[PDB]
Amino acid sequence: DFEEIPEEYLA
Amino acid sequence: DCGLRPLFEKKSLEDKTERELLESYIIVEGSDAEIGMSPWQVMLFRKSPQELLCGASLISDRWVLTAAHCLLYPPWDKNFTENDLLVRIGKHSRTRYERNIEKISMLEKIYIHPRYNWRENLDRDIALMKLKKPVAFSDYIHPVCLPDRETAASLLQAGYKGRVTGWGNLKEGQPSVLQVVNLPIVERPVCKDSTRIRITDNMFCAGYKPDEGKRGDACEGDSGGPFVMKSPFNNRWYQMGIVSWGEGCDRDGKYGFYTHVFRLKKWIQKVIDQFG
Ligand SMILES: C[C@@H](NC(=O)Cc1c(Cl)ccc(NCC(F)(F)c2cccc[n+]2[O-])[n+]1[O-])c1cccc(Cl)c1
C-alpha cells in the first residue's frame, strides 16, 4: 500500500 | 553541526518528550513523532515489490548507517544488493510520497561488518551504505552524531533513557506516520537473564521491566533504525545503538537488543576514510 514514487528514482 | 535539529535545537525549541530523557540522566506502544523530530531518520525502501525494508540513519551527507541483518541474513534468504534498494530521507508518513520534503537517493555501495555474526546471535549487526550523490540538508533532513569514548561512557548507563524511532509494526497493524518511543537502558545481567541467546559486548538491551509499568519496544520493520540519546553536556543527539534483535515485541520480561555503535566505531571510521 505504498504510493508510487517518481520514475526518475526507480530507473 | 551533527545532532542539532533545525526545527528544535537550532530554534531553541524542545520536543514533547526529550525532557524525559534528560531527567533520566542522573514501534509498539510508542507515539507519532513530531515534524522534524528525527531528521536523521532513514527509510530503506525495497524497489520490487515496493515495501518497507528497514530503518536506518543519516550520519553524513553521503553515509547511511543500518543493521547488517537488514541487508544480509541467510536464514531468511535475505541478500540485498545496491540496486535492490532506495534510501528515503526526510520522511514522516510511512506509505505516501512526501513531495517537496523527502529525498530519495540510490546506493553506490554497501559495507557489512566483516565479522557480522548472522549464524548465531547477530553479533556486530552493523552496516554502512554510501549514497551515489550527497543529500541536501533541510529542516527535515539532518545528520545525527556518532558517540566518542567519553559520550558512550557517560550516557550508556542502566536507567538512562534513549529514543527509538521507526515505521515498523505497532504490535507483535502498521503506523500512518513515524513512531517514537523512549526506553531505558537495562543492566547487563538483566539482559542476559532474559534470553537464551548469547549476548556480547557489541550489544546492549533496553526496555521497561514488568514492575515498572510503562512499556514500548521496536518490532518488525524497525530493524536498522537508531537508538539515540541527547547529550546533557552539549545538547546534541548521538546515535548510541541500532535496532537489532528481540524475541517477540514488547513482551513482559523481554528486552530489545541494540548494536553498540561506539564499540564498532573503529570499523565505521575505517570504512569512511578509506572509501568515502
Ligand atoms: C525488528 C526486530 N529484529 C529482528 O527481527 C531481527 C532478528 C533476526 Cl534477523 C533473527 C532472529 C531474531 N530474533 C530471535 C532470536 F532468537 F532472539 C535471535 C537473535 C539473534 C540471532 C538469532 N535469533 O534467533 N531477530 O529479532 C526486533 C524486534 C523487537 C526488538 C528489537 Cl530491538 C528488534
Side-chain angles (χ1 to χ4, degrees), chain B residues 69 73 76 120-122 197 217-220 223 243-249 256-258:
Chain B
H69 86 259
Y73 194 63
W76 297 345
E120 190 199 331
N121 59 0
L122 291 184
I197 304 290
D217 190 13
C219 201
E220 180 168 35
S223 297
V243 180
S244 185
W245 62 273
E247 304 175 84
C249 300
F257 284 74
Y258 304 76

Side-chain angles (χ1 to χ4, degrees), chain B residues 1-25 27-276:
Chain B
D1 196 26
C2 68
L4 296 175
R5 301 170 294 177
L7 295 181
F8 293 92
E9 286 77 18
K10 289 284 191 170
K11 309 167 63 171
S12 190
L13 289 181
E14 306 185 314
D15 64 55
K16 36 69 180 176
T17 68
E18 57 173 278
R19 189 71 176 183
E20 174 183 2
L21 268 44
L22 284 310
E23 294 179 336
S24 74
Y25 306 151
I27 302 291
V28 181
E29 287 292 315
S31 62
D32 299 341
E34 294 167 62
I35 300 306
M37 188 185 222
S38 304
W40 36 78
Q41 194 75 198
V42 172
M43 175 186 293
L44 295 189
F45 194 66
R46 159 130 85 153
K47 291 182 176 181
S48 317
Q50 293 191 305
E51 64 179 7
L52 208 189
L53 217 295
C54 259
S57 62
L58 185 66
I59 57 175
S60 195
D61 70 305
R62 301 196 66 193
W63 290 90
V64 174
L65 180 71
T66 190
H69 86 259
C70 279
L71 309 171
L72 177 69
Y73 194 63
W76 297 345
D77 292 84
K78 174 175 302 177
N79 193 178
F80 293 112
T81 47
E82 289 74 29
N83 290 64
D84 290 352
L85 309 167
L86 287 179
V87 157
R88 305 178 69 174
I89 319 180
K91 294 188 58 57
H92 179 62
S93 169
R94 177 177 68 85
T95 62
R96 302 306 128 178
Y97 176 60
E98 306 175 271
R99 181 160 52 93
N100 292 20
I101 297 180
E102 75 170 278
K103 296 304 179 182
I104 307 180
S105 310
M106 300 185 290
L107 310 176
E108 175 179 302
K109 194 61 183 296
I110 289 173
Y111 302 89
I112 301 174
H113 197 289
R115 302 192 62 190
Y116 155 57
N117 190 343
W118 51 266
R119 291 178 156 283
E120 190 199 331
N121 59 0
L122 291 184
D123 187 33
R124 306 194 184 79
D125 193 6
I126 193 166
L128 282 170
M129 306 184 110
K130 186 184 178 187
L131 312 179
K132 285 188 183 296
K133 276 301 180 180
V135 178
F137 298 155
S138 74
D139 281 352
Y140 321 96
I141 299 181
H142 200 85
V144 70
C145 305
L146 290 190
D148 53 76
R149 168 165 273 94
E150 288 62 271
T151 301
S154 56
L155 302 187
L156 221 63
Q157 301 189 58
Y160 281 39
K161 293 177 179 175
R163 176 179 287 173
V164 182
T165 46
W167 288 281
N169 299 341
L170 300 169
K171 325 196 77 165
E172 176 179 335
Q174 306 174 300
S176 169
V177 306
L178 186 64
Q179 293 300 107
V180 60
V181 67
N182 301 324
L183 303 165
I185 291 169
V186 178
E187 298 85 351
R188 293 188 66 74
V190 176
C191 297
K192 281 196 176 73
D193 288 350
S194 74
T195 181
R196 278 170 159 264
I197 304 290
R198 192 194 80 199
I199 305 174
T200 76
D201 298 326
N202 301 307
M203 1 165 138
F204 68 83
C205 89
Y208 291 101
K209 298 178 171 59
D211 58 283
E212 299 187 306
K214 309 180 185 64
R215 49 208 310 124
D217 190 13
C219 201
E220 180 168 35
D222 290 328
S223 297
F227 173 100
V228 301
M229 298 179 90
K230 179 169 178 173
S231 172
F233 304 100
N234 61 190
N235 277 57
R236 288 173 188 264
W237 291 88
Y238 285 90
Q239 185 174 344
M240 311 306 299
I242 300 170
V243 180
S244 185
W245 62 273
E247 304 175 84
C249 300
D250 196 47
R251 296 183 191 170
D252 288 353
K254 291 291 183 173
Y255 304 87
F257 284 74
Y258 304 76
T259 308
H260 194 312
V261 176
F262 173 64
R263 285 274 300 187
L264 306 175
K265 192 180 183 187
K266 42 177 296 301
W267 172 73
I268 296 174
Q269 305 180 188
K270 191 167 302 179
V271 172
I272 291 182
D273 56 50
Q274 185 182 307
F275 295 99

